[PDB]
Amino acid sequence: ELDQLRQEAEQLKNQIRDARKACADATLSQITNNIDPVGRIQMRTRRTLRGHLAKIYAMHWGTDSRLLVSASQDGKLIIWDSYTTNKVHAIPLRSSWVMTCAYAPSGNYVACGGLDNICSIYNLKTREGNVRVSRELAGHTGYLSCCRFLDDNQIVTSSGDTTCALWDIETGQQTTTFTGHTGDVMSLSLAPDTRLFVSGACDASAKLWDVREGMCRQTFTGHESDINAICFFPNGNAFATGSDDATCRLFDLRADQELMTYSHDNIICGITSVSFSKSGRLLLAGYDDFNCNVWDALKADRAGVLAGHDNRVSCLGVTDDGMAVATGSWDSFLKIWN
Amino acid sequence: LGGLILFGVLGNILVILSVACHRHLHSVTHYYIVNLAVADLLLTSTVLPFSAIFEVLGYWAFGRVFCNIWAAVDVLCCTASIMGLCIISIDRYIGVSYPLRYPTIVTQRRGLMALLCVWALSLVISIGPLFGWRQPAPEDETICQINEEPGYVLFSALGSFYLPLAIILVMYCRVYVVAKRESKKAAKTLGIVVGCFVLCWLPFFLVMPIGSFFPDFKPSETVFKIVFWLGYLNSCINPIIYPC
Amino acid sequence: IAQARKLVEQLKMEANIDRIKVSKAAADLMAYCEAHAKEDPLLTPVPASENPFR
Amino acid sequence: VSAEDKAAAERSKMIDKNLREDGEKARRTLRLLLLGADNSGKSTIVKGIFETKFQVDKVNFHMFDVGRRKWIQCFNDVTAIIFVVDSSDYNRLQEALNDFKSIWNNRWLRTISVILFLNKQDLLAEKVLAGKSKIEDYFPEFARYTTPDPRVTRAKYFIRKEFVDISTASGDGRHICYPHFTCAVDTENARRIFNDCKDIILQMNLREYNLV
Amino acid sequence: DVQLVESGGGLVQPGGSRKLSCSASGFAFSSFGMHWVRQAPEKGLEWVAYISSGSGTIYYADTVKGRFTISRDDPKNTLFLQMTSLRSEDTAMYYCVRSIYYYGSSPFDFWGQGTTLTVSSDIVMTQATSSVPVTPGESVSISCRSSKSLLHSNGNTYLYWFLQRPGQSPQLLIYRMSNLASGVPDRFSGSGSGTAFTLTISRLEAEDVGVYYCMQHLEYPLTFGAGTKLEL
Ligand SMILES: CS(=O)(=O)Nc1c(O)ccc2c1CCC[C@@H]2C1=NCCN1
């Protein structure tokens, strides 16, 4: 019985690989070979945010493209006004070990989590004038590595117990569980329509999940190490992953296969963060060699380097209007580039 | 001449910028390096150009009112630099003798107190001549002369070099004892650190009281200028070695 | 034993997805990138008057 | 430039002051990462994520026990790692050595010193005296090893020699292992951790001051 | 839950001294800036004084500067206004108003009750209308004018609208000329440009009668309007 099922699974994987091969006539490099190159891009540090006294792990932009939130080892979740570099809020965290933070699309809530296996959601708009914790989602049996808001009441989290979860903040219990990863899930990216999302794990695998039914639709492989970062294309028909093998990869949902690989012989260090520009032409990739790189997502050519951090770059995000890029690092400084 | 001023100002500005560029410089041991760099920057930016113009022209140009102030800012900057070296040595001694009690001994709201006390003592020493205790000024304003009043020379020289020197020597001897006990690398480093300070300041602070109290053994003007500029050399050299 | 059955069920579910050619998807991505070139403040420098971060 | 902007800036400065106060308060604590494995007795070495705080000589130590592949990079700035090994069980000794080698050669722990705690030495002595199980059965090198009861001392020194052989290889002196032998009824582990942390901080300060 | 009670007041001889107290409860009093605003027995609202969070900044109106001193005791959650040499023009009703200042905040959101006191250049805000008779269910508009443009270089138009119902303390309706205060029905809307603003209410209902005030927060001193009185 077990041998028959294993042989059937091998046959199914061979069929999937053959189907993917049959639907690969050209390549993204060949099609965009006659396109006009982006050229040289030189962003400069417009703002430098100081006030964190330890390594910064996560950073999320608000939907107004002006407020942002960052989380550090000092037990601090700081909400900054990026235009004037004014600390709008400073939230003390119950657990000093936090690896992720999120900003609600409405701007009324923030979220954080880490080695405590809890997702703490803090309400920012209270009559008392202080930021209080609104909810504490529990149920994951591993550390939380990412969390993203869908509404003011629904949040998707990825944990180190090889599972993802869609919660209900009002009730405080999981409404959907996403299983199928064998290693720890390190990142997740919500689709622009918020009907699907993608999760990358330590098994060098990315999975596309449908939020409604709650099952994996497509599985993407090709990395040779743990996937640390993942981000959706602006139109929601593709996504990009960064891994510890010093490579970035672009996968297409409709083609169900890899399109482009962004790597260089000089780079031998893993990617900690990844993001897309508003147009999707630029892929921002943060590395642990103390600097970030900009890739021409259609030509796989490095269009510029964001340097100015003296330690490992941990988080990297782009505003919804595409004005600026915020990059955090382990030197406790997060910078804004334009 | 000018090259020394440029080198010193560039080194001090670079040290100041580099300290603020990273948050690892949040401890008092970097505040002290910032204080030393600020003192040397102020010196090489304000005092040193006037001294070089004095050496080039050979006569005061800013006037008696505007050169008597130059005889006090120079003292203030030099004393501030020397006491900055002293507090750096004290901080290193406390950090070496008490490793895990250093944060609860050398604390902000106390390191800042030491930082302010250094400049307080520097200004107390330097406001001597400005309030009257100085030699009778010459009638000709085109000449500007140092304050060779024996009492002021003794007091300023003592409280500016000899009092800091004893503290530096004691603290660094204890640091050397601990370093050799806890385990030649420390010997060379401490030797360089002490030797730069001594070779730069001891000649001037030895030939000054000698000329002030023993006119028979008064040295020449050329060696006087050399030992005068050795302090400027110390100010220019401090950012080369102390941050590194 | 049930793990293998779940795995083969998942593989059968993922093997029924209809896949378009790589050329069509690449063309769609290129068209999306071209249609929004003028709306990307990072791709092309913005004059300092309209730049929020000076 | 605006009154509301000025008030917001004043609020930001107050937040900055509070953050610096909390950071200064938090700099006076030393954090230890407690590692090991089950049956090693790591929980009783000192009398989500588990935390413990103990004070000695007006110094506060925080020991964190998680439960070591991905999250361990979060502990790249701790003062020391307390590794606990159960030396009584020779069956798992090679597993413990492999785990210690993995911890020692980790890229995010290349500057962290390890305070090794060879736990349950009384059980090791009892097993050696009984003679039912022989170390040479699992480690063939014990046959020709001689100590610098004599048999218990020889076995203990052989185990410590194996761990120090793992440590000193590819160490370069940037972090030092501090082996110790401990029993369940021992009560001097806090003092040993205090002394080892003092040595670690002293070496850090000496390296900072460009000394030895 | 949020409550600002006031104590003191009463009859004061001219030239005397009096200390008004404002006790806070139900909110983080330490993080809120505080204002004292007085209303004459038959006139509009007059801004008296302001103390920042942490007592780092204090402002007074030129009418009371020198004679009034504002202070706060954070551990006791108390606000004090010490007044000396009280003239006969200082008889009013005093309110302590909380206001927190950060990006997107709503200053003057909560006003305390009133404490009575009977003693025996600046930007001018103009409310041309002094009384508008209206009927329920009919949309009306209140106009206000500014001598200087309240629009700032940062894009914010620092204009605030307040409603004082008969026998009740003022409450914030609209802040920064467009944003709607929390708890205020969507029947209120605010529009206008520099030096000319309007507040439009559609489907007027009961409990909306009373006085409407336009205040500017561009620069101290803070000045109110005359007050447009909507009556049935
Ligand atoms: C020797 S003194 O008692 O006259 N006062 C004093 C001082 O302590 C320290 C440096 C100095 C002076 C005076 C004259 C300027 C002299 C100096 N400035 C640059 C290097 N050397």
Short mmCIF file of C-alpha atoms in Angstrom, two decimals, chain D residues 1-11 14, chain E residues 52-53 56-57 100-101 152 154 158 160 217 220:
data_model
loop_
_atom_site.label_atom_id
_atom_site.label_comp_id
_atom_site.label_asym_id
_atom_site.label_seq_id
_atom_site.Cartn_x
_atom_site.Cartn_y
_atom_site.Cartn_z
CA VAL D 1 6.81 75.67 11.89
CA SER D 2 3.24 75.06 13.06
CA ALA D 3 2.00 74.91 16.64
CA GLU D 4 0.69 71.36 16.25
CA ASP D 5 3.97 70.34 14.59
CA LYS D 6 5.90 71.86 17.50
CA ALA D 7 3.78 69.94 20.01
CA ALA D 8 4.25 66.72 18.02
CA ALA D 9 8.01 67.29 18.03
CA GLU D 10 7.93 67.83 21.80
CA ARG D 11 6.03 64.55 22.18
CA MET D 14 9.63 62.94 25.34
CA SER E 52 2.24 71.03 27.30
CA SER E 53 2.80 67.38 28.18
CA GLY E 56 7.88 71.70 28.79
CA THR E 57 5.90 74.48 27.10
CA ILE E 100 -2.89 65.36 22.37
CA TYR E 101 -0.69 66.30 19.42
CA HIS E 152 -0.20 75.87 6.17
CA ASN E 154 2.25 71.27 5.03
CA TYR E 158 -5.95 74.30 11.07
CA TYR E 160 -11.79 73.46 14.21
CA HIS E 217 -5.04 76.51 15.68
CA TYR E 220 -1.02 81.04 19.49
#
